[PDB]
């Protein structure tokens, strides 16, 4: 089966890209390393990487592999995640140096799985692009390797990825995480603005002529999905259940600020 | 009462003796072992039945599916008379499992007919094993109804006793309930996929 | 195989890696350097002749494929060269070559010959080896650019109505037929008598499976408003009969294909479906046992079981009691004007609640 279909890395390696490229320690343009990733042999589940100082020019090829082997020992010793998969490089894409460091990678001899870093302000070109190669026969020149592109999936632990989702809101304009409750109710309201502005126009489009096309039983099913679990139909018996909930939180909350008093009250008659 | 975490931690000390790394979980074991050829390697005496125990569910037609082949293996002499100790736990499991099924499937059937609807080998210990399913809370039904009109209730209790304790012993029937943040949830789910 | 990373100029290079290849091509190849520098004659020689007895030549067939975009008439030699993919009848090493130049990379789809031609290549190659993972390839481009060439988009209408029988399954049937219906709905095939094929099969497919719930994915955006109702075939038969709820309103309508299919289990289920759905809708999200009993005109035990058959299918879903709250909120079947009026007064219910409830939280935020 094709080993290279989709490489499943997450924003740890995105943070490994920028930081390594925003200090560099005189890393002119091109930073490279050995990609660390697991293999289900269909979807390539990736986590971490680690980087090297290079003089990547023509025709000087440099990836400190032995060092990348020794910090492979570090990365695995810290977390039992993966083993080395390939070389991960900055711009530009496939040339003679990328295959001369694949020689440096066949020095240790696993199955290659790569990841390019895009040093550009394009929007059409995706920020990050993973690469494999077949043929991969090569008892010939240096390495005449036939590169396949790999689409990326951003799939690991989801409270990271919702942590990412607020890093996306930092990315917009931070956005410190201080007022958790108060501010996750602001974005809960922001969600409800998206509903009303969306639901009104997809109504009034079919009031005019032929709206609710991509909104017939797509959002129509997801209007139903809104009301599936908020609110509940109109059951005043469940409102009483809640109104007794309003009693028990008051209690949880009262117990709460009393044990606040029970700090200094008991714990500090030490303080006389 | 005294130090709950002892024997549950000792379950590792048993598991390490067995050659296990973590303590045992449930049917997930048999399903990463029907990954192997077992549900075909097993004899067509009981190849076909496990497909009803787990996957093919019915609150009406599984008390008359499990128990026929219970008797089909009850064959004592030449069908290894050691596999006969599993009939009163298959009973115990069938009660508390198929009761979860019925309890999530519908929300009210009188045991005036549930008694015969489960035509097993029990009657009064059947009632008291339905009470045993209620007390230790595989499900919730209002236990000791004299008229025997036992409704299950909605919702009031997805606290400690929904999954009993966390593992799901329901095949993909179970009906819906509401709780706290559940708003954000589906509302904000069904939101961001259509855009 | 032998390397490609010699000087490029891949002409005498490909000759010398083909050195190992079969007699029929390697009695010509290296000698072809005196015919021309040889990137049309030598680049067509492998396209005609077959391999040793093996497809492992995929590794030097990478060279063969990557040597088409630059030197050759790529659109003519991408319809060909992916025709050894049919002439061997293997479905894994071909499946390497199919994805290596699936399109958009090391070949770079024009103007879309490399989608269709490599798609039909995949079709003849493997049953479901790549054919599982060739929906994303197509829908990657449905999400950005509808096929400009209607001649190749009609050849796409062929490869999607091919997929239906390629892998035999209810969802592969659904996906392949209904996504062809989707792009037909947007911008393709009109083409009056060529729309009738989609009308014919949208009968058979949504009559075969419940993957339109009854008529719903044939009523979603524009899959019956182009697939005309009172047609040659009369598409409106099941449309009106989806709310008549009588075997007589099936019997009276069906022609001698639906008669021979035949509609026997579908009536009983779909009757119990849309009747409980409309029962739910009116009287009143929490309906009477006796109502549903004397609407379906059958007993108690079948009805009890068939309420949960109704929620497992999930045209309606929530907790169900014995004689009250039989079927429940969510009207998951089609609602034409009933959704339009309620969706209007629900976005009214929102403008009411959520704009008021945000400044209620912004009071404490």
mmCIF file of N, CA, C and O in Angstrom, chain C residues 232-288:
data_model
loop_
_atom_site.group_PDB
_atom_site.id
_atom_site.type_symbol
_atom_site.label_atom_id
_atom_site.label_comp_id
_atom_site.label_asym_id
_atom_site.label_seq_id
_atom_site.Cartn_x
_atom_site.Cartn_y
_atom_site.Cartn_z
ATOM 1 N N UNK C 232 -41.362 12.574 -18.310
ATOM 2 C CA UNK C 232 -41.450 11.263 -19.029
ATOM 3 C C UNK C 232 -41.768 10.141 -18.027
ATOM 4 O O UNK C 232 -42.708 9.365 -18.299
ATOM 5 N N UNK C 233 -41.021 10.067 -16.916
ATOM 6 C CA UNK C 233 -41.038 8.947 -15.931
ATOM 7 C C UNK C 233 -41.984 9.239 -14.756
ATOM 8 O O UNK C 233 -42.336 8.268 -14.054
ATOM 9 N N UNK C 234 -42.356 10.508 -14.535
ATOM 10 C CA UNK C 234 -43.208 10.981 -13.407
ATOM 11 C C UNK C 234 -42.432 10.801 -12.094
ATOM 12 O O UNK C 234 -42.665 9.794 -11.393
ATOM 13 N N UNK C 235 -41.532 11.745 -11.794
ATOM 14 C CA UNK C 235 -40.752 11.813 -10.523
ATOM 15 C C UNK C 235 -41.677 12.150 -9.344
ATOM 16 O O UNK C 235 -41.315 11.778 -8.208
ATOM 17 N N UNK C 236 -42.815 12.819 -9.586
ATOM 18 C CA UNK C 236 -43.722 13.319 -8.511
ATOM 19 C C UNK C 236 -44.517 12.179 -7.856
ATOM 20 O O UNK C 236 -45.162 12.456 -6.829
ATOM 21 N N UNK C 237 -44.490 10.957 -8.403
ATOM 22 C CA UNK C 237 -45.214 9.774 -7.859
ATOM 23 C C UNK C 237 -44.905 9.610 -6.364
ATOM 24 O O UNK C 237 -45.847 9.729 -5.558
ATOM 25 N N UNK C 238 -43.636 9.368 -6.018
ATOM 26 C CA UNK C 238 -43.166 9.186 -4.607
ATOM 27 C C UNK C 238 -43.152 10.533 -3.864
ATOM 28 O O UNK C 238 -43.296 10.494 -2.629
ATOM 29 N N UNK C 239 -42.983 11.666 -4.565
ATOM 30 C CA UNK C 239 -42.999 13.042 -3.986
ATOM 31 C C UNK C 239 -44.315 13.284 -3.239
ATOM 32 O O UNK C 239 -44.262 13.652 -2.047
ATOM 33 N N UNK C 240 -45.451 13.096 -3.920
ATOM 34 C CA UNK C 240 -46.812 13.303 -3.337
ATOM 35 C C UNK C 240 -47.094 12.136 -2.379
ATOM 36 O O UNK C 240 -47.577 12.408 -1.262
ATOM 37 N N UNK C 241 -46.748 10.902 -2.777
ATOM 38 C CA UNK C 241 -46.959 9.646 -2.003
ATOM 39 C C UNK C 241 -46.115 9.612 -0.717
ATOM 40 O O UNK C 241 -46.405 8.748 0.135
ATOM 41 N N UNK C 242 -45.121 10.500 -0.574
ATOM 42 C CA UNK C 242 -44.333 10.699 0.668
ATOM 43 C C UNK C 242 -45.175 11.383 1.758
ATOM 44 O O UNK C 242 -44.650 11.516 2.882
ATOM 45 N N UNK C 243 -46.392 11.851 1.442
ATOM 46 C CA UNK C 243 -47.354 12.419 2.430
ATOM 47 C C UNK C 243 -48.780 11.869 2.246
ATOM 48 O O UNK C 243 -49.656 12.297 3.027
ATOM 49 N N UNK C 244 -49.023 10.957 1.293
ATOM 50 C CA UNK C 244 -50.337 10.272 1.119
ATOM 51 C C UNK C 244 -50.425 9.096 2.100
ATOM 52 O O UNK C 244 -51.489 8.945 2.736
ATOM 53 N N UNK C 245 -49.350 8.305 2.213
ATOM 54 C CA UNK C 245 -49.175 7.183 3.169
ATOM 55 C C UNK C 245 -50.253 6.115 2.938
ATOM 56 O O UNK C 245 -51.103 5.910 3.832
ATOM 57 N N UNK C 246 -50.213 5.463 1.773
ATOM 58 C CA UNK C 246 -51.087 4.318 1.404
ATOM 59 C C UNK C 246 -50.425 3.500 0.290
ATOM 60 O O UNK C 246 -50.050 4.110 -0.732
ATOM 61 N N UNK C 247 -50.318 2.178 0.480
ATOM 62 C CA UNK C 247 -49.817 1.182 -0.510
ATOM 63 C C UNK C 247 -50.519 1.366 -1.864
ATOM 64 O O UNK C 247 -49.894 1.074 -2.903
ATOM 65 N N UNK C 248 -51.774 1.831 -1.851
ATOM 66 C CA UNK C 248 -52.602 2.097 -3.067
ATOM 67 C C UNK C 248 -51.992 3.275 -3.848
ATOM 68 O O UNK C 248 -52.038 3.220 -5.091
ATOM 69 N N UNK C 249 -51.438 4.284 -3.159
ATOM 70 C CA UNK C 249 -50.770 5.464 -3.783
ATOM 71 C C UNK C 249 -49.323 5.126 -4.181
ATOM 72 O O UNK C 249 -48.661 6.017 -4.747
ATOM 73 N N UNK C 250 -48.845 3.910 -3.885
ATOM 74 C CA UNK C 250 -47.620 3.300 -4.472
ATOM 75 C C UNK C 250 -48.023 2.425 -5.666
ATOM 76 O O UNK C 250 -47.492 2.649 -6.771
ATOM 77 N N UNK C 251 -48.946 1.478 -5.443
ATOM 78 C CA UNK C 251 -49.477 0.502 -6.439
ATOM 79 C C UNK C 251 -49.913 1.228 -7.720
ATOM 80 O O UNK C 251 -49.499 0.807 -8.820
ATOM 81 N N UNK C 252 -50.730 2.276 -7.564
ATOM 82 C CA UNK C 252 -51.369 3.061 -8.660
ATOM 83 C C UNK C 252 -50.306 3.731 -9.545
ATOM 84 O O UNK C 252 -50.546 3.830 -10.765
ATOM 85 N N UNK C 253 -49.182 4.163 -8.959
ATOM 86 C CA UNK C 253 -48.173 5.049 -9.605
ATOM 87 C C UNK C 253 -47.080 4.229 -10.305
ATOM 88 O O UNK C 253 -46.754 4.566 -11.462
ATOM 89 N N UNK C 254 -46.536 3.211 -9.626
ATOM 90 C CA UNK C 254 -45.299 2.472 -10.015
ATOM 91 C C UNK C 254 -45.447 1.861 -11.417
ATOM 92 O O UNK C 254 -46.509 1.264 -11.690
ATOM 93 N N UNK C 255 -44.413 2.008 -12.259
ATOM 94 C CA UNK C 255 -44.282 1.350 -13.592
ATOM 95 C C UNK C 255 -43.576 -0.004 -13.405
ATOM 96 O O UNK C 255 -43.271 -0.352 -12.245
ATOM 97 N N UNK C 256 -43.296 -0.724 -14.500
ATOM 98 C CA UNK C 256 -42.917 -2.165 -14.494
ATOM 99 C C UNK C 256 -41.431 -2.370 -14.139
ATOM 100 O O UNK C 256 -40.967 -3.523 -14.271
ATOM 101 N N UNK C 257 -40.706 -1.329 -13.702
ATOM 102 C CA UNK C 257 -39.337 -1.436 -13.122
ATOM 103 C C UNK C 257 -39.429 -1.453 -11.589
ATOM 104 O O UNK C 257 -38.781 -2.317 -10.965
ATOM 105 N N UNK C 258 -40.205 -0.528 -11.012
ATOM 106 C CA UNK C 258 -40.500 -0.458 -9.546
ATOM 107 C C UNK C 258 -41.346 -1.679 -9.151
ATOM 108 O O UNK C 258 -41.219 -2.127 -7.992
ATOM 109 N N UNK C 259 -42.169 -2.196 -10.075
ATOM 110 C CA UNK C 259 -42.974 -3.438 -9.899
ATOM 111 C C UNK C 259 -42.047 -4.654 -9.747
ATOM 112 O O UNK C 259 -42.408 -5.565 -8.973
ATOM 113 N N UNK C 260 -40.905 -4.667 -10.450
ATOM 114 C CA UNK C 260 -39.952 -5.810 -10.534
ATOM 115 C C UNK C 260 -38.730 -5.613 -9.622
ATOM 116 O O UNK C 260 -37.847 -6.498 -9.651
ATOM 117 N N UNK C 261 -38.664 -4.527 -8.837
ATOM 118 C CA UNK C 261 -37.476 -4.196 -7.995
ATOM 119 C C UNK C 261 -37.354 -5.169 -6.815
ATOM 120 O O UNK C 261 -36.291 -5.769 -6.667
ATOM 121 N N UNK C 262 -38.383 -5.361 -5.969
ATOM 122 C CA UNK C 262 -39.658 -4.657 -5.938
ATOM 123 C C UNK C 262 -39.909 -4.026 -4.576
ATOM 124 O O UNK C 262 -39.307 -4.490 -3.585
ATOM 125 N N UNK C 263 -40.771 -3.006 -4.533
ATOM 126 C CA UNK C 263 -41.174 -2.267 -3.303
ATOM 127 C C UNK C 263 -42.083 -3.179 -2.461
ATOM 128 O O UNK C 263 -43.273 -3.311 -2.819
ATOM 129 N N UNK C 264 -41.534 -3.809 -1.409
ATOM 130 C CA UNK C 264 -42.247 -4.808 -0.560
ATOM 131 C C UNK C 264 -41.962 -4.562 0.934
ATOM 132 O O UNK C 264 -42.946 -4.500 1.700
ATOM 133 N N UNK C 265 -40.690 -4.439 1.339
ATOM 134 C CA UNK C 265 -40.275 -4.033 2.714
ATOM 135 C C UNK C 265 -40.397 -2.512 2.869
ATOM 136 O O UNK C 265 -40.791 -2.061 3.965
ATOM 137 N N UNK C 266 -40.052 -1.767 1.811
ATOM 138 C CA UNK C 266 -39.945 -0.283 1.785
ATOM 139 C C UNK C 266 -41.291 0.348 2.159
ATOM 140 O O UNK C 266 -41.271 1.290 2.972
ATOM 141 N N UNK C 267 -42.405 -0.144 1.599
ATOM 142 C CA UNK C 267 -43.767 0.392 1.871
ATOM 143 C C UNK C 267 -44.035 0.355 3.377
ATOM 144 O O UNK C 267 -44.315 1.425 3.942
ATOM 145 N N UNK C 268 -43.938 -0.835 3.982
ATOM 146 C CA UNK C 268 -44.266 -1.095 5.410
ATOM 147 C C UNK C 268 -43.465 -0.131 6.293
ATOM 148 O O UNK C 268 -44.097 0.603 7.070
ATOM 149 N N UNK C 269 -42.135 -0.102 6.138
ATOM 150 C CA UNK C 269 -41.225 0.781 6.920
ATOM 151 C C UNK C 269 -41.581 2.251 6.650
ATOM 152 O O UNK C 269 -41.936 2.947 7.619
ATOM 153 N N UNK C 270 -41.519 2.685 5.384
ATOM 154 C CA UNK C 270 -41.682 4.099 4.952
ATOM 155 C C UNK C 270 -43.095 4.615 5.265
ATOM 156 O O UNK C 270 -43.230 5.835 5.475
ATOM 157 N N UNK C 271 -44.103 3.734 5.284
ATOM 158 C CA UNK C 271 -45.477 4.040 5.777
ATOM 159 C C UNK C 271 -45.395 4.400 7.265
ATOM 160 O O UNK C 271 -45.838 5.506 7.626
ATOM 161 N N UNK C 272 -44.845 3.489 8.079
ATOM 162 C CA UNK C 272 -44.625 3.668 9.542
ATOM 163 C C UNK C 272 -43.714 4.877 9.800
ATOM 164 O O UNK C 272 -43.891 5.516 10.854
ATOM 165 N N UNK C 273 -42.779 5.170 8.886
ATOM 166 C CA UNK C 273 -41.854 6.333 8.980
ATOM 167 C C UNK C 273 -42.650 7.643 8.925
ATOM 168 O O UNK C 273 -42.798 8.289 9.981
ATOM 169 N N UNK C 274 -43.155 8.004 7.740
ATOM 170 C CA UNK C 274 -43.672 9.366 7.428
ATOM 171 C C UNK C 274 -44.996 9.624 8.167
ATOM 172 O O UNK C 274 -45.325 10.812 8.362
ATOM 173 N N UNK C 275 -45.721 8.568 8.556
ATOM 174 C CA UNK C 275 -46.983 8.664 9.343
ATOM 175 C C UNK C 275 -46.664 9.107 10.777
ATOM 176 O O UNK C 275 -47.336 10.042 11.259
ATOM 177 N N UNK C 276 -45.696 8.454 11.433
ATOM 178 C CA UNK C 276 -45.223 8.798 12.804
ATOM 179 C C UNK C 276 -44.582 10.192 12.785
ATOM 180 O O UNK C 276 -44.838 10.961 13.732
ATOM 181 N N UNK C 277 -43.791 10.500 11.748
ATOM 182 C CA UNK C 277 -43.172 11.833 11.503
ATOM 183 C C UNK C 277 -44.254 12.923 11.500
ATOM 184 O O UNK C 277 -44.057 13.951 12.167
ATOM 185 N N UNK C 278 -45.341 12.720 10.749
ATOM 186 C CA UNK C 278 -46.437 13.719 10.609
ATOM 187 C C UNK C 278 -47.346 13.679 11.843
ATOM 188 O O UNK C 278 -47.876 14.747 12.193
ATOM 189 N N UNK C 279 -47.522 12.506 12.462
ATOM 190 C CA UNK C 279 -48.181 12.351 13.775
ATOM 191 C C UNK C 279 -47.481 13.176 14.840
ATOM 192 O O UNK C 279 -48.166 13.979 15.506
ATOM 193 N N UNK C 280 -46.162 12.976 14.985
ATOM 194 C CA UNK C 280 -45.229 13.803 15.805
ATOM 195 C C UNK C 280 -45.520 15.289 15.567
ATOM 196 O O UNK C 280 -45.740 16.016 16.556
ATOM 197 N N UNK C 281 -45.523 15.699 14.296
ATOM 198 C CA UNK C 281 -45.531 17.108 13.833
ATOM 199 C C UNK C 281 -46.776 17.858 14.331
ATOM 200 O O UNK C 281 -46.657 19.082 14.548
ATOM 201 N N UNK C 282 -47.910 17.166 14.521
ATOM 202 C CA UNK C 282 -49.250 17.801 14.726
ATOM 203 C C UNK C 282 -49.724 17.660 16.180
ATOM 204 O O UNK C 282 -50.089 18.703 16.763
ATOM 205 N N UNK C 283 -49.726 16.447 16.750
ATOM 206 C CA UNK C 283 -50.600 16.084 17.903
ATOM 207 C C UNK C 283 -49.834 15.336 18.997
ATOM 208 O O UNK C 283 -50.158 14.184 19.271
ATOM 209 N N UNK C 284 -48.842 15.957 19.662
ATOM 210 C CA UNK C 284 -48.224 17.232 19.322
ATOM 211 C C UNK C 284 -46.786 17.228 19.870
ATOM 212 O O UNK C 284 -46.568 17.795 20.961
ATOM 213 N N UNK C 285 -45.862 16.574 19.148
ATOM 214 C CA UNK C 285 -44.455 16.268 19.555
ATOM 215 C C UNK C 285 -44.438 15.220 20.684
ATOM 216 O O UNK C 285 -43.341 14.732 21.012
ATOM 217 N N UNK C 286 -45.604 14.838 21.214
ATOM 218 C CA UNK C 286 -45.755 14.007 22.438
ATOM 219 C C UNK C 286 -47.009 13.140 22.265
ATOM 220 O O UNK C 286 -47.880 13.146 23.160
ATOM 221 N N UNK C 287 -47.067 12.392 21.159
ATOM 222 C CA UNK C 287 -48.341 11.955 20.510
ATOM 223 C C UNK C 287 -48.965 10.801 21.301
ATOM 224 O O UNK C 287 -48.274 10.213 22.159
ATOM 225 N N UNK C 288 -50.235 10.510 21.009
ATOM 226 C CA UNK C 288 -51.044 9.446 21.657
ATOM 227 C C UNK C 288 -50.701 8.086 21.037
ATOM 228 O O UNK C 288 -50.508 8.023 19.805
#
